[PDB]
Enzyme design. Structure first.
Site, mmCIF file in Angstrom:
data_model
loop_
_atom_site.group_PDB
_atom_site.id
_atom_site.type_symbol
_atom_site.label_atom_id
_atom_site.label_comp_id
_atom_site.label_asym_id
_atom_site.label_seq_id
_atom_site.Cartn_x
_atom_site.Cartn_y
_atom_site.Cartn_z
ATOM 1 C CB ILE B 16 -0.959 0.035 1.210
ATOM 2 C CG1 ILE B 16 -0.179 -0.017 2.524
ATOM 3 C CG2 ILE B 16 -1.946 -1.119 1.137
ATOM 4 C CD1 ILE B 16 -1.048 0.089 3.755
ATOM 5 N N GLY B 19 7.709 3.787 2.011
ATOM 6 C CA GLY B 19 8.471 4.762 2.764
ATOM 7 C C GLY B 19 9.851 4.920 2.159
ATOM 8 C CB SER B 20 12.572 7.376 2.715
ATOM 9 O OG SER B 20 11.864 8.493 2.207
ATOM 10 N N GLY B 22 12.032 1.945 2.606
ATOM 11 C CA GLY B 22 11.180 1.009 3.317
ATOM 12 C C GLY B 22 9.850 0.799 2.619
ATOM 13 C CG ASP B 23 9.042 -1.700 0.460
ATOM 14 O OD1 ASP B 23 9.178 -0.594 -0.105
ATOM 15 O OD2 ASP B 23 9.729 -2.701 0.171
ATOM 16 C CG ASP B 129 9.803 14.682 9.356
ATOM 17 O OD1 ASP B 129 9.879 15.640 8.560
ATOM 18 O OD2 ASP B 129 9.755 13.492 8.981
#
Ligand SMILES: [Zn+2]
EC number: 2.7.11.1
Lengths: 101, 374
Positions: B16, B19-20, B22-23, B129
């Site tokens: 879905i 990420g940087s 990452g998944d 962040d």
């Protein structure tokens, strides 16, 4: 075990069954609707929230049946609509998910 | 083969999010059938953070909008974090609404974000962040609740035994779009810097863009320099030109905060809550995407009715659907005017309601049933 190649083969078959194995006359589930969005989350996690039968959402009645249940008949998914309205969370009007005929 | 599991309790489904380095995978509990989100991080990453934020989530456990971690541990090559499933981000919903949010939605979102940030600060943490991507909606009946993710850059700003703030430092390493002005100057990030970053996001929601966006330069270093030159140069009045004064009062307040002083969260709450009263907004939990998704679905099912008894389009068709929804809920949809360099009164904002009531869409026979809808 869990490897990168395992995740590839798992994701390939899913998107194969996602492309042309979801057979229903539902508008949101249709392939035409997915071409409209490049960000699949807006479809899979936001528009599948809608309910066609006012009992199960589209991710449960359509997606889980054609994509997951076909790969594994025992693959379980719950009805998140049957869950309680938890106290801490903001109120969610369920009428926004119910599709009018 | 097709049955990949994590933590012996969850099975991995469709991908879905990415990420940087990452998944993110959709998943289900094997026993109860509950939907979960599964974050995977490879151990061969230069900056692993999944273990760290795993500890943060569990420390911030018991808070509204704070994703409850269901399991963390290692699976083969990956570090696996499993949380309850969440909906799309606000950046996703921003793109869904073609990058413009109503005044109502922005205020409703602001009021939820204020509480999220205050809670994190109340647990001796700062996020450092803050961006639309780090705020997600829930799924199902949590769809109204704004959640907060990605605590990789999160840091404790105070001790626990004593409420003594971290010392003032400089030359701290410089998200350039929403970062605080002091973050560009190398000054240590504080509670003030989070709220200032939040303001930049809200202004970004109303206008759909920021002054430091879309700046050009030959040398790429100059590109980064122009943005910093932009944040420091732009006055608060110019920054919140076509917005209500409440926005300017917010940014002025946050940028005047000292490095260690505690923000008046209740003031920020009232400030926008008073604005919503002026704009006659009610607490009906109706976002722009909520009414758009509903109106869209309402229109498309009428297609089947017509048939039985009979990418350029998307910008045009959504425009037709947005207008129809704008007519159906004329009091809800108020937008920022590009032309305006002055702070509009609630009247001018409430003037749009009359315009939305006297609005006309292209569709004929379909709109006839939309009249019949009532
Ligand atoms: Zn369907």
């Amino acid at each position: 075990c869990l490897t990168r190649s395992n995740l590839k083969k798992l994701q390939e078959k899913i998107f194969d069954r996602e492309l042309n194995d979801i057979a229903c006359d539902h508008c949101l589930c249709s392939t035409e609707n997915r071409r409209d969005i490049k960000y699949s989350r807006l479809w899979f996690l936001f528009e599948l929230e809608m309910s066609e039968n006012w009992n199960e959402n589209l991710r449960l009645s359509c997606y889980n049946k054609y994509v997951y249940s076909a790969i594994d008949e025992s693959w379980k998914m719950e009805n998140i609509l049957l869950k309680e309205q938890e106290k801490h969370y903001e109120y969610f009007p369920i009428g926004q998910l119910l599709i009018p005929n | 083969a097709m049955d990949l599991r994590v933590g012996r309790k969850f099975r991995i489904g469709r991908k879905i999010g990415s990420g940087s380095f990452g998944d993110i995978y959709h998943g289900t509990n094997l026993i109860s059938g509950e939907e979960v989100a599964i974050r995977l991080e490879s151990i061969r990453s230069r900056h692993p953070q999944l273990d760290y934020e795993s500890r943060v989530y569990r420390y911030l456990s018991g808070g509204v909008g704070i994703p409850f971690i269901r399991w963390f541990g290692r699976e083969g090559e990956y570090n696996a974090m499993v949380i309850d499933l969440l909906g799309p981000s606000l950046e996703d919903l921003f793109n869904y609404c073609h990058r413009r949010f109503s005044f109502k939605t922005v205020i409703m979102l602001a009021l939820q974000m204020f509480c999220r940030i205050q809670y994190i600060h109340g647990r001796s943490f700062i996020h450092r962040d803050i961006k639309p991507d780090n705020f997600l909606m829930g799924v199902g009946r949590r769809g109204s609740t704004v959640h907060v993710i990605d605590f990789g850059l999160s840091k404790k700003y105070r001790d626990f035994n004593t409420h003594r703030h971290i010392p003032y430092r400089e030359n701290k390493s410089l998200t350039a779009r929403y970062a605080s002005v002091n973050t560009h100057l190398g000054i240590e990030q504080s509670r003030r810097d989070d709220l200032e970053s939040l303001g930049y996001v809200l202004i970004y929601f109303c206008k759909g863009s920021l002054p430091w966006q879309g700046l050009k330069a030959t040398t790429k270093k100059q590109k980064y320099d122009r943005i910093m030159e932009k944040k420091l140069n732009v006055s608060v009045e110019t920054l919140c030109s076509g917005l209500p004064l409440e926005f300017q009062e917010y940014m002025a307040y946050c940028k005047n905060l000292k490095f260690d002083e505690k923000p008046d969260y209740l003031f920020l709450a009232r400030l926008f809550k008073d604005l919503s009263i002026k704009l006659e907004y009610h607490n009906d939990h109706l976002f722009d995407w909520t009414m758009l998704r509903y109106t869209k679905a309402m229109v498309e099912k009428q297609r089947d009715l017509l048939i039985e008894k009979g990418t350029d389009n998307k910008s045009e068709t959504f425009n037709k659907i947005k207008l129809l929804a704008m007519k159906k809920f004329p009091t809800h949809f108020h937008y920022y005017k590009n032309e305006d360099k002055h702070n509009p009164s609630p009247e001018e904002i409430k003037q749009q309601t009359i315009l939305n009531n006297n609005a006309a869409s292209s569709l004929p026979e379909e709109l006839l049933n939309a009249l019949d809808k009532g």
